[PDB]
Write a protein that binds this ligand. Structure first.
Ligand SMILES: CC[C@@H]1C(=O)N(C)c2cnc(Nc3ccc(C(=O)N[C@H]4CC[C@H](N5CCN(CC6CC6)CC5)CC4)cc3OC)nc2N1C(C)C
Length: 127
């Protein structure tokens, strides 16, 4: 099996805007997670071919990763902060679907999610 194409990161047929929440999501949330020790498995789409995991995309039908999220933010792909937050949560949830609780990768994801939730609790105000 091939990899699927990666998630779309730009779309000129969607209106675009910058908001202080979206800016915060890039400059604080993404930045903070990205530089974490355990960020690396989540910085790009899962290359199931390289990892020789033919079952990964048989079960994960909404893949998501921070590389994609970062590009989406950089390309003003999101109109609402909640769209971006949903992408992070999808990424975490995917990990908790494919992998056994307590596995290495799950502990890693959990560490990131804790930091994620901490930064989101500090999200600035709408406008
Ligand atoms: C899939 C199931 C499960 C799961 O749920 N997730 C999310 C998951 C995700 N990922 C992995 N693995 C890997 C991930 C990544 C790599 C990599 O090579 N990463 C490299 C990417 C290129 C990097 N860079 C360095 C600087 N370059 C340019 C800068 C200098 C200018 C840019 C290029 C260096 C690091 C290797 C992996 O494994 C060998 N496993 C996963 N697991 C399991 C297998 C448990």
């Amino acid at each position: 099996s091939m990899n699927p194409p990666p998630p779309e990161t730009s779309n000129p047929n969607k209106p675009k805007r910058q908001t202080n929440q979206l800016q915060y999501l890039l400059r604080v949330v993404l930045k903070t997670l990205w530089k974490h020790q355990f960020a690396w498995p989540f910085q790009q789409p899962v290359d199931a071919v390289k990892l020789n995991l033919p079952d990964y995309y048989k079960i994960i039908k909404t893949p998501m990763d921070m590389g994609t999220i970062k590009k989406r933010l950089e390309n003003n792909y999101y109109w609402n902060a909640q769209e971006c937050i949903q992408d992070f949560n999808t990424m975490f949830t995917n990990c908790y679907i494919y992998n056994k609780p307590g596995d290495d990768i799950v502990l890693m994801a959990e560490a990131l999610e804790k930091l994620f939730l901490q930064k989101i609790n500090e999200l600035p105000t709408e406008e």
